Amino acid sequence: TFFTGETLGQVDLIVDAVYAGYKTERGGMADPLVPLVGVSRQGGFRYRGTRERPTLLVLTSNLAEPEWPDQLDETTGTFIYYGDNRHPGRLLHDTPRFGNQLLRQIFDWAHLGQRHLVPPILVFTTEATGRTFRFRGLAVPGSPALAATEDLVALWKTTEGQRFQNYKAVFTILDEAVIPRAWVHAVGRGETSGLAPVAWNAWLSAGGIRPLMAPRSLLVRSKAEQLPATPEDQALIEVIRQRYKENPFGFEACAGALTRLLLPDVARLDLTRPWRDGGRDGIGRLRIGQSPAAIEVDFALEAKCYGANNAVGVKEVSRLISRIKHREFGVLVTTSYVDRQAYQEVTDDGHPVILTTAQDIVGLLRSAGVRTPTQVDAWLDGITASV
């Protein structure tokens, strides 16, 4: 499932298949989406037809951007895509290539009962070896799990002393393994076609969405994956490790805060509970559902403030495991990584234990708008002062 040369004028669009460019003349790299789809060679988002009436829309994403965290949830087939107003100075819909206007118009159509105007959305993600793209699926606006009003939202971003709006758009990948290029090019030329995938026609007629849901097989992460890659994030975690060197137990509070960011409530927290080994037995309460229709489940918290050179092993994990006997699950927050043996034991024995490692802390901090050591410091000041 790797396509490079003239094959791009023949092969269909296959989910998670890789479509690579080729060298033409003098350093010029041919964009594969041109023969594969028929769009232009340029944008991060590309369309056919006019902007007022687009016939087909191609969305590409790097997934390397921490500023605008586009993401494809393989599990639910949900694709989160951020708009094209990425810096201060211009209003929401005023962009050079009009991506926000496009998004607005598409969601307008989808919501107003005119789905026939909505162009097929083809999602691609860059593998970033020269110019290559992995096809992620055919998508529709909205989601079966979201409120109607929350599928296209305008967020306020703050960068270098200024406030500007940008779109966060939610799409759902339809359950289709193969998208006929005949259909793509036909619709792209403005033609009417009967080669439309069943899920697409279904969405057209009824408005309903059949998502491509691909739950992850059991995963054991490596050391590199759990620890930050860049030195900056490493500095970020280091600030945390330094904050609690004089008061280790205090880190639990921090863990708690991180937990509230990670978890679908605001977890209730009881961090002050003397346990048998002289340490504390931190516990939490989580609500599942939406009151009046919801239940509460309890979890045990375990926080290990370690250096990256010191792994979390079988012993540390076994503490938490022993603490989750009468509780639904456990969360383990650590500024380091969990070694092979412990991870393997946890995934294999099916223990309900969340493993939040250093990289995860970095991500959670990113979502909280903390990208710099000073910001980490202020954040920690906030935690210590608020508990």
**Window 23 to 62, contacts with a second copy (CB under 8 A):** none
User: Is residue 195 a contact residue for a second copy (CB under 8 A)?
Assistant: no
Smallest separation (angstroms) from a second copy to the CB of 209: 6
User: Is residue 222 a contact residue for a second copy (CB under 8 A)?
Assistant: no
Tell me whether residue 183 or residue 203 sits nearer to a second copy (CB atom). Answer: 203
User: Is residue 295 a contact residue for a second copy (CB under 8 A)?
Assistant: yes
Name residues contacting a second copy, limited to 327-386 (CB under 8 A).
328-329, 331, 350, 352-357, 359-360, 363-364, 367-369, 378-379, 381-386
Q: What does the alpha-carbon distance between residue 56 and residue 39 come to, in Å, rounded to a whole number?
A: 9
Tell me whether residue 155 or residue 182 sits nearer to a second copy (CB atom). Answer: 155
Q: What does the alpha-carbon distance between residue 259 and residue 356 come to, in Å, rounded to a whole number?
A: 9
Which of 27, 28, 96, 292 touches a second copy by CB under 8 A?
A: 292
User: Is residue 157 a contact residue for a second copy (CB under 8 A)?
Assistant: yes
Handedness of CA 218, 224, 226, 232 (dihedral sign): negative
Give 58-62 contacts, CB < 8 A, sequence gap 24+.
58/33, 58/121, 58/122, 58/124, 59/121, 59/122, 59/123, 59/124, 59/139, 59/171, 60/33, 60/124, 60/125, 60/126, 60/133, 61/123, 61/124, 61/125, 61/126, 62/125, 62/126, 62/128
Tell me whether residue 16 or residue 191 sits nearer to a second copy (CB atom). Answer: 16
Which of 214, 234, 314, 373 touches a second copy by CB under 8 A?
A: 214
Per-residue x/- marks for a second copy, 69-108, CB under 8 A?
Answer: ----xxxxxx-x-------xxxxx-----------x--xx
User: Is residue 288 a contact residue for a second copy (CB under 8 A)?
Assistant: yes
Structure tokens belonging to residue 93:
């819909």
User: Is residue 178 a contact residue for a second copy (CB under 8 A)?
Assistant: yes
Residue at 330: amino acid letter: G
Are 168 and 80 in contact by the 8 Å Cβ rule? The answer is yes
Q: Tell me, by CB under 8 A, how many residues bind a second copy.
A: 126
